[PDB]
Amino acid sequence: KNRGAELVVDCLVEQGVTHVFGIPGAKIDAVFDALQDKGPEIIVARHEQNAAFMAQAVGRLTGKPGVVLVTSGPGASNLATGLLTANTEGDPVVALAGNVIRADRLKRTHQSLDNAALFQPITKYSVEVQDVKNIPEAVTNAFRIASAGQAGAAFVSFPQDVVNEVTNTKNVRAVAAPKLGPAADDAISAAIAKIQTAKLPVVLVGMKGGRPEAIKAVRKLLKKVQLPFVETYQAAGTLSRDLEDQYFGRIGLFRNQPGDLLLEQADVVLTIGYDPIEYDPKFWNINGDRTIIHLDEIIADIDHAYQPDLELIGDIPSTINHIEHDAVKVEFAEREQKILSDLKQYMHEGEQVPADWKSDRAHPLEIVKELRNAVDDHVTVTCDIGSHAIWMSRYFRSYEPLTLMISNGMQTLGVALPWAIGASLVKPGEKVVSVSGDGGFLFSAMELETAVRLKAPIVHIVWNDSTYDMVAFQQLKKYNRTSAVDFGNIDIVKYAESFGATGLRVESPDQLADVLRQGMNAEGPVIIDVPVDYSDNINLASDKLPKEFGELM
């Protein structure tokens, strides 16, 4: 029809977008109309927050920007947290939003605000198009900027008259953002030299080390050089079953893990795609004096506790390959071998249900174990935020890239189920597993209607305790009292059923394996109610292990 709206759809077509997540409204209507003629499939969301989470999941899983499309005013403002989350967790997302006509842009008029100014602090790129001619340029740059390292959120606002205006404007080529080359040669050489001369060189795999191509490169380096390593939460899946012996767990949240003690003992740390948001360096880079090699697609943030002696800036997998090719196996002296062994044993003890445990409900580690054992390595598992997520982030092994998805920048409640829906669209023919607490579940559970409507093969595990627990035990640790953490319980089975989904319940802890398998074999979306005992949770913040290990040394 030659409107600005058609230019928007044309960009989405050129970009290879297959799904647009959105909710329509008057100001953005023409784009939704143009999408009836051609373009990506519209996935109708039940809340713009969830459309944004779904777009985030697509960006994380495909490396190409998830797309969310909304109307003016509350349509756009409902995107705030979603875009903020994607923008701090390395996920490319392009948001497209309506606004009032240019002529009324300054007025007190229905659903008008400064769209661009609102998204400026929470996006890589936030613009409003004020001439129909500029649409293909603004949108194309939005895609490129969202994808370029470090990937993030891009926001483009369209005044209603701009998307409705008839124009003879041409589209532009979807010029793909090009990758950087590997880090400079002298820097690669210096890193190899730092690793070979080290008493105990260790690898810290972070956010951008968790991409598939980076994991593949990391694995070769780890196997050849036989470096011990650790994961941040978003680096989950770096581990392969072959590397279990060199693996020292997931660091984060509280400094009391074997990975912390390993990092303390290292004299050289090679960090890969490390965004410190996942775990501030003031937590691990302590004790004193150790070499930091910072390997990433962008330069490091300088911190009191993070002053890289060496920066290898460039494309991450290429850089890792250069190191791998010329580095040789590292030989450990006996002192360090013993250290590695002890930490490995402490690690194994940390993963066990306590000897003095008895309960009418499952221990978190029982839920983790049974879940891991009922789900194939290749199945994508998404996780929400809370005490369950501490357990999952630490103890749920993952062995394939992008099969354990966690919000570890913004720690945003409600992401798990919509992430799973985004995942299922990206992985047709595959089950997707989502895990949340009961608090976070209701943040986005209305999107279960979307899952049912799509007949998505999603299995949602709700850890049921009836509190905002992650807040609660930290409150007890600081103040010895809780505040605003209690709510009533709902019937999760019947909630599921009211949406036309399947609802299951682990009625007693011994039924865990059977019910989980039943979910994996059920038709359509499943919600599983899993009662959990959280009395052991305060130990997630316990300082026993760093003290024990300190006495040993």
Residues 152-181 that bind its own copies (CB under 8 A): 159, 161, 169-170, 172-173, 175, 177-181
Please provide the size of the chain in residues. Answer: 553
* Residue 536 binds its own copies, judged by CB under 8 A: no
Task: Map tokens 């661009």 to a residue.
Answer: 116
Closest CA to 126 of 147, 102, 146, 151: 146
Closer to ligand TPP by CB, 88 or 387: give it: 387
Query: Smallest distance from the beta carbon of 83 to its own copies, in angstroms?
Result: 9
Which of 182, 437, 519, 531 is in the footprint of its own copies by CB under 8 A? Answer: 182
Within 10 angstroms of residue 481's Cβ, the number of other Cβ atoms is 8
Q: Is position 364 an interface residue for Mg ion (rule: CB under 5 A)?
A: no
Residue nearest to ligand TPP (CB): 437
Count of C-beta atoms within a 10 Å radius of residue 78: 20
**Distance between CA 530 and CA 199 in Å, rounded?**
46
**438 counts as binding Mg ion under rule CB under 5 A:** yes
DSSP for 302-329, please give it: PBTTB--SEEEES-HHHHHHHHHHH--P
Cβ-in-10-Å burial (0-12, 13-18, 19+) of 356 comes to: exposed
> Does residue 98 bind ligand TPP (CB under 6 A)?
no
Of the ranges 140-148, 221-229, 467-475, 489-497, which one interacts with ligand TPP (CB under 6 A)?
467-475
Only one of the segments 195-203, 258-266, 330-338, 466-474 lies at the binding site for ligand TPP (rule: CB under 6 A); that segment is 466-474
**Is residue 2 a contact partner of residue 168, using CB atoms and an 8 Å limit?**
yes
Considering only residues 2 through 41, tell me which ones interact with ligand TPP, judged by CB under 6 A: 23, 25
In 357-415, where do the E strands start and end? 380-383, 404-405
Determine contact, residues 158/96, Cβ cutoff 8 Å: yes
Among 474, 511, 518, 542, binds its own copies (CB under 8 A): 474
Q: In what order do the strands lie in the sheet with 153-159?
A: 41-44, 19-23, 66-70, 93-99, 153-159, 125-128
Number of residues interacting with its own copies: please give it, by CB under 8 A: 126
Contact mark string toward ligand TPP, 401..430, x via CB under 6 A:
----------xxx-----------------
Question: Taking CB under 5 A as the rule, does residue 437 contact Mg ion?
Answer: yes
Applying CB under 6 A, among 471, 476, 493, 520 the residue interacting with ligand TPP is 471
529 binds Mg ion (CB under 5 A): no
Return the number of the residue (284 or 463) whose C-beta is nearest Mg ion.
463
Helix (H) or strand (E) segment spanning residue 288: none
Residue 468 near ligand TPP by CB under 6 A: yes
Q: Is 25 in the site for its own copies (CB under 8 A)?
A: yes
And the tokens for 40?
A: 């990506």
Structure tokens at 414: 């409600």
Which CB, 81 or 265, lies closer to its own copies? 81
What is the contact surface with ligand TPP in residues (CB under 6 A)?
23, 25, 71, 74-75, 78, 384-388, 411-413, 436-440, 463, 465, 467-471
